[PDB]
Design a protein around this motif. Sequence first.
Motif, mmCIF file in Angstrom:
data_model
loop_
_atom_site.group_PDB
_atom_site.id
_atom_site.type_symbol
_atom_site.label_atom_id
_atom_site.label_comp_id
_atom_site.label_asym_id
_atom_site.label_seq_id
_atom_site.Cartn_x
_atom_site.Cartn_y
_atom_site.Cartn_z
ATOM 1 N N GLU A 109 1.846 -23.518 26.336
ATOM 2 C CA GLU A 109 1.777 -23.225 24.913
ATOM 3 C C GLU A 109 0.441 -23.601 24.288
ATOM 4 O O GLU A 109 0.276 -23.436 23.075
ATOM 5 C CB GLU A 109 2.907 -23.950 24.173
ATOM 6 C CG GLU A 109 3.547 -23.147 23.058
ATOM 7 C CD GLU A 109 4.811 -23.797 22.530
ATOM 8 O OE1 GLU A 109 4.714 -24.892 21.937
ATOM 9 O OE2 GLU A 109 5.901 -23.214 22.707
ATOM 10 N N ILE A 124 0.936 -17.353 11.811
ATOM 11 C CA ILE A 124 1.511 -18.472 11.073
ATOM 12 C C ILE A 124 0.466 -19.262 10.301
ATOM 13 O O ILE A 124 0.816 -19.902 9.296
ATOM 14 C CB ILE A 124 2.305 -19.414 12.004
ATOM 15 C CG1 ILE A 124 3.242 -18.606 12.897
ATOM 16 C CG2 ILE A 124 3.124 -20.418 11.205
ATOM 17 C CD1 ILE A 124 3.308 -19.118 14.304
ATOM 18 N N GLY A 125 -0.799 -19.220 10.708
ATOM 19 C CA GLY A 125 -1.828 -19.957 10.006
ATOM 20 C C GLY A 125 -2.264 -21.239 10.669
ATOM 21 O O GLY A 125 -2.881 -22.084 10.013
ATOM 22 N N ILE A 126 -1.961 -21.418 11.951
ATOM 23 C CA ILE A 126 -2.345 -22.606 12.702
ATOM 24 C C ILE A 126 -3.355 -22.198 13.764
ATOM 25 O O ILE A 126 -3.221 -21.138 14.388
ATOM 26 C CB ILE A 126 -1.125 -23.293 13.342
ATOM 27 C CG1 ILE A 126 -0.479 -22.376 14.385
ATOM 28 C CG2 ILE A 126 -0.121 -23.696 12.273
ATOM 29 C CD1 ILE A 126 0.907 -22.774 14.795
ATOM 30 N N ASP A 127 -4.383 -23.013 13.939
ATOM 31 C CA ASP A 127 -5.260 -22.844 15.088
ATOM 32 C C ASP A 127 -4.568 -23.404 16.325
ATOM 33 O O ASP A 127 -3.952 -24.474 16.251
ATOM 34 C CB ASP A 127 -6.600 -23.537 14.859
ATOM 35 C CG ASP A 127 -6.465 -24.820 14.065
ATOM 36 O OD1 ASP A 127 -5.336 -25.344 13.962
ATOM 37 O OD2 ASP A 127 -7.491 -25.301 13.541
ATOM 38 N N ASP B 22 -3.579 -34.005 -0.177
ATOM 39 C CA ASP B 22 -4.649 -33.015 -0.247
ATOM 40 C C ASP B 22 -4.956 -32.434 1.129
ATOM 41 O O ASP B 22 -5.111 -31.216 1.270
ATOM 42 C CB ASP B 22 -5.901 -33.637 -0.864
ATOM 43 C CG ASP B 22 -5.727 -33.952 -2.336
ATOM 44 O OD1 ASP B 22 -4.730 -33.493 -2.930
ATOM 45 O OD2 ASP B 22 -6.589 -34.658 -2.900
ATOM 46 N N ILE B 23 -5.039 -33.286 2.156
ATOM 47 C CA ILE B 23 -5.294 -32.793 3.508
ATOM 48 C C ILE B 23 -4.175 -31.860 3.950
ATOM 49 O O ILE B 23 -4.416 -30.836 4.601
ATOM 50 C CB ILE B 23 -5.465 -33.962 4.496
ATOM 51 C CG1 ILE B 23 -6.256 -35.104 3.863
ATOM 52 C CG2 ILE B 23 -6.153 -33.487 5.766
ATOM 53 C CD1 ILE B 23 -7.663 -34.740 3.498
ATOM 54 N N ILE B 26 -4.894 -28.362 2.303
ATOM 55 C CA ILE B 26 -6.020 -27.551 2.748
ATOM 56 C C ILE B 26 -5.818 -27.036 4.170
ATOM 57 O O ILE B 26 -6.359 -25.985 4.530
ATOM 58 C CB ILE B 26 -7.334 -28.342 2.634
ATOM 59 C CG1 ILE B 26 -7.378 -29.119 1.319
ATOM 60 C CG2 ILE B 26 -8.523 -27.408 2.720
ATOM 61 C CD1 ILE B 26 -8.650 -29.910 1.122
ATOM 62 N N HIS B 27 -5.052 -27.750 4.992
ATOM 63 C CA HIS B 27 -4.757 -27.304 6.344
ATOM 64 C C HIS B 27 -3.470 -26.496 6.435
ATOM 65 O O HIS B 27 -3.099 -26.071 7.534
ATOM 66 C CB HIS B 27 -4.682 -28.506 7.293
ATOM 67 C CG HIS B 27 -6.022 -29.062 7.660
ATOM 68 N ND1 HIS B 27 -7.082 -28.263 8.030
ATOM 69 C CD2 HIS B 27 -6.477 -30.336 7.707
ATOM 70 C CE1 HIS B 27 -8.131 -29.021 8.293
ATOM 71 N NE2 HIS B 27 -7.790 -30.284 8.106
ATOM 72 N N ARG B 29 -3.000 -24.013 3.802
ATOM 73 C CA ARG B 29 -3.224 -22.903 2.882
ATOM 74 C C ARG B 29 -2.900 -21.568 3.541
ATOM 75 O O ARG B 29 -2.296 -20.690 2.916
ATOM 76 C CB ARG B 29 -4.668 -22.915 2.382
ATOM 77 C CG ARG B 29 -5.698 -23.080 3.485
ATOM 78 C CD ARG B 29 -7.106 -23.216 2.936
ATOM 79 N NE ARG B 29 -7.990 -23.874 3.892
ATOM 80 C CZ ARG B 29 -8.777 -23.236 4.747
ATOM 81 N NH1 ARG B 29 -8.822 -21.915 4.792
ATOM 82 N NH2 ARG B 29 -9.537 -23.941 5.580
ATOM 83 N N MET B 31 -0.864 -21.286 6.022
ATOM 84 C CA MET B 31 0.465 -21.372 6.605
ATOM 85 C C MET B 31 1.512 -20.820 5.646
ATOM 86 O O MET B 31 1.464 -21.049 4.435
ATOM 87 C CB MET B 31 0.794 -22.820 6.973
ATOM 88 C CG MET B 31 1.888 -22.957 8.018
ATOM 89 S SD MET B 31 1.966 -24.608 8.740
ATOM 90 C CE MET B 31 0.241 -25.081 8.685
ATOM 91 N N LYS B 55 -3.847 -32.729 10.030
ATOM 92 C CA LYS B 55 -4.024 -31.401 10.604
ATOM 93 C C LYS B 55 -3.195 -31.231 11.869
ATOM 94 O O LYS B 55 -2.643 -30.150 12.105
ATOM 95 C CB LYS B 55 -5.502 -31.144 10.898
ATOM 96 C CG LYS B 55 -5.772 -29.833 11.616
ATOM 97 C CD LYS B 55 -7.261 -29.572 11.753
ATOM 98 C CE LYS B 55 -7.530 -28.427 12.714
ATOM 99 N NZ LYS B 55 -8.983 -28.116 12.816
ATOM 100 N N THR B 59 -0.364 -28.436 12.520
ATOM 101 C CA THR B 59 -0.393 -27.599 13.713
ATOM 102 C C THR B 59 0.914 -27.698 14.490
ATOM 103 O O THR B 59 1.436 -26.684 14.958
ATOM 104 C CB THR B 59 -1.578 -27.989 14.598
ATOM 105 O OG1 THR B 59 -2.801 -27.638 13.940
ATOM 106 C CG2 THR B 59 -1.510 -27.271 15.937
ATOM 107 N N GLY B 62 3.655 -25.821 12.743
ATOM 108 C CA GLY B 62 3.553 -24.418 13.105
ATOM 109 C C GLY B 62 3.992 -24.129 14.526
ATOM 110 O O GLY B 62 4.594 -23.083 14.791
ATOM 111 N N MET B 63 3.693 -25.036 15.457
ATOM 112 C CA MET B 63 4.112 -24.883 16.845
ATOM 113 C C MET B 63 5.626 -24.862 16.974
ATOM 114 O O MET B 63 6.169 -24.076 17.760
ATOM 115 C CB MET B 63 3.540 -26.021 17.698
ATOM 116 C CG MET B 63 2.023 -26.004 17.903
ATOM 117 S SD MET B 63 1.257 -24.518 18.590
ATOM 118 C CE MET B 63 2.527 -23.906 19.693
ATOM 119 N N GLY F 101 -10.666 -32.793 1.832
ATOM 120 C CA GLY F 101 -9.858 -33.404 0.803
ATOM 121 C C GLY F 101 -9.949 -34.917 0.827
ATOM 122 O O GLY F 101 -10.240 -35.529 1.852
ATOM 123 N N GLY F 102 -9.711 -35.522 -0.334
ATOM 124 C CA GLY F 102 -9.682 -36.968 -0.433
ATOM 125 C C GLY F 102 -11.052 -37.609 -0.514
ATOM 126 O O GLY F 102 -11.230 -38.617 -1.204
#
Lengths: 139, 101, 396, 61, 48, 102
Positions: A109, A124-127, B22-23, B26-27, B29, B31, B55, B59, B62-63, F101-102
């Motif tokens: 995966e 989905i928007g994930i790297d 905030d983090i 931004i990670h 957005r 999604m 982040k 991720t 999302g996985m 951010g932050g």
Amino acid sequence: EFLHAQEEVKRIQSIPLVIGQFLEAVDQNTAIVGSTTGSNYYVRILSTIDRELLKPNASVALHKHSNALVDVLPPEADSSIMMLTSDQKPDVMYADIGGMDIQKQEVREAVELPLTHFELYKQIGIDPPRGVLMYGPPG
Amino acid sequence: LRPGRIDRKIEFPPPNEEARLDILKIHSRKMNLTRGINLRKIAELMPGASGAEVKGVCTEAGMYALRERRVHVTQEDFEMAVAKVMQKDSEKNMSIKKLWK
Amino acid sequence: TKGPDAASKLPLVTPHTQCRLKLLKLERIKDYLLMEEEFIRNQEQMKPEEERSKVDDLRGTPMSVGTLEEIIDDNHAIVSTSVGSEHYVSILSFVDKDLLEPGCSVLLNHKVHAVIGVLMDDTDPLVTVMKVEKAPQETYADIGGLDNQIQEIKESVELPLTHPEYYEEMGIKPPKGVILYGPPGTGKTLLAKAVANQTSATFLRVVGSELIQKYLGDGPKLVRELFRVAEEHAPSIVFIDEIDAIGTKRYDSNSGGEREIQRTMLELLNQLDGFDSRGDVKVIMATNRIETLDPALIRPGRIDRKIEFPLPDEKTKKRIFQIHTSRMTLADDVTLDDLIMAKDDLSGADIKAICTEAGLMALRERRMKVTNEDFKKSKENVLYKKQEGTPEGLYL
Amino acid sequence: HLNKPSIQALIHGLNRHYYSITINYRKNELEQKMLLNLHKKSWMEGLTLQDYSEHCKHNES
Amino acid sequence: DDIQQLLKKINELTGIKESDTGLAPPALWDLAADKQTLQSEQPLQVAR
Amino acid sequence: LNAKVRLLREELQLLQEQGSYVGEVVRAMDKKKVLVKVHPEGKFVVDVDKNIDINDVTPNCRVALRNDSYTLHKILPNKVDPLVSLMMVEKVPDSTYEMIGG
Ligand SMILES: Nc1ncnc2c1ncn2[C@@H]1O[C@H](COP(=O)(O)OP(=O)(O)OP(=O)(O)O)[C@@H](O)[C@H]1O
Ligand SMILES: [Mg+2]
């Protein structure tokens, strides 16, 4: 006369040819590539040669006599640090290894699935994860 | 590290709750977040989460939808992803742990 | 002896309040510079041949550079081509047979190899760049305190050149070789830039790392060439900053790369005190750690004065503040004594950083006049990298 | 015409010790015609149909 | 800034200082025989 | 078409001129003499073409010398080490301040 000129232009790429490394570009149709003979020469460049393959390490080919950039050779990085060649496949099927279903799925995966199905990752928007760490008892 | 060479020595401390939120924003957005996913609560579940671990949490959330062939991530997909990325290694030995009272 | 090739510094203007007299002095310098430019350009334009022309046809183009190795006859010699071979060349008439000396760089005809010139001033461009041509703009008045330290360096590199009678009438050989050591940011390189701004002698500078090379023979040869140039150029000063790079304590190294480090150090030692005495060339070395240098390198005879730069005292810190706040626009409520009295180990670089930071906090509040609060803030926002490391309340 | 004194030969001495002479080649008929047979093809060439498999491959590419 | 630019250009106008190549005084010159030495004598490679 | 064939013929003629050496300038030596350092060979006190102003020939340049006459005919861009040359950014990253951010 134009087909004639194109023909002699192609002729300048005859195959007495030294190879040198494209050190730097000066401006259009000229270069500073240093030959493998042991010297660096300020040369001219063929118009037919595309300038975007003239990366500042390319092992370009030079005319033997006039010593001008006449041909850019494809890079040579086939097995510099033992990149697995087509004859060095481990020959270990996924079905050959027993169990490890969760471990296989997690590894598949991150290092195999993203290469093939990148669209599903981007949907989905994930790297995709870039590194995995397999750890446990030896063997 | 003497001044004249380094005038400013800027510290990057682990983000606080209002910063980790905030983090998380931004990670995520890009999604496809559902309705009712309180990103602050997930941030509240990550005390001292470095900032790259936020982040990583996004991720992994999302996985957890990739293995189910979806495009939307629910609150449970994040809460079960926080425990994965924000995992901890304990001493696993009371004898060593009680070396100090 | 080509003479001291001292750096070219323009005359200083010393109003610093941006008043009209500053403009008058700067305009006077501008007018003289314009007049000098007019002189040279009008000399080239106003200025509108058989003897040297025959010589230039005889030499031809190009004109190789070889190393002389033997003067066989008055008209015959042996030179080494720049690849390493040898040739039994002929010596032409226009070649001056006095400057023809073994080891010197000779000019050779390209087609028929033959000595056709002598190339003096063949210094390695790694060494011609070591010479300071534009003097630093930090005068001795730009240093606060260090009066004892300045006096020590001024009696070894400036006084022996302005009043040699004092040294010779007494029987001394003036101190030749000083080492500047102390905590980081105390004013050692500042003192070097200050003497370079006041000396009338050529000031070669080196970080003690340009004189180290990958090639086997290049390392010690470069320091030999540097000292040869220093001796050739009359009174000279060689500033080897950060000498700890090369001149560390010797040891039996099992690595070839490190054994050459000691080998070029041992040529720096030879060029300082060896069988052949040095010329009128002073050496100024700087290092943050004197306890790591080899005992022979800092041995008296090679280094005569060990100028110590301790962290600035209260009075020295107060003077450093005024030096670094002279161009500021301080408010009437800015009493600097609040920051100086603090027992923190504040170096001069620390003071300059506080001044810059204090000015920046004024721009934070849209002000070009710094107040006292800006300084109290900049002290905290700049006093990092040292935190607070001390023993706890053991001692009373 | 027909040449400009070359740099590669000027430095070794041109118009000083020896001078170049314009080169001209006497080529006439009954000699060129015999020479054109170096790459002349033949009657068979021009009627060959190439190879249809690789012709289709090249056309598709 | 004008002072700085003027200093740059004026040092550019005269920075190249003559470096003589050790020519003998014209009195001790034999150019006529020097050309003969150049053309007749040949460079001999030193060998063992 | 005449312009195209002319361009081709001028390129053909210019391609037959031999490549020129490159060398570092130690220092200038007259008004028409410049000391250079060809890479495989040693030093060379070379001439200067009439199209080059010698005031632009600074020490440690990378002037180009003709194939046979060894005549300076171009200043050429200055030499930087190939390993220290890749350290310069030619493609800026795609990370913006809005992504922090932050
Ligand atoms: N006595 C002083 N008076 C004025 N400025 C000072 C003084 N001492 C130090 N400074 C300031 O310290 C700054 C740091 O540079 P400086 O040349 O002093 O470093 P250094 O002590 O040689 O450093 P290092 O140990 O890292 O080589 C200078 O720009 C200078 O303005
Ligand atoms: Mg210093």
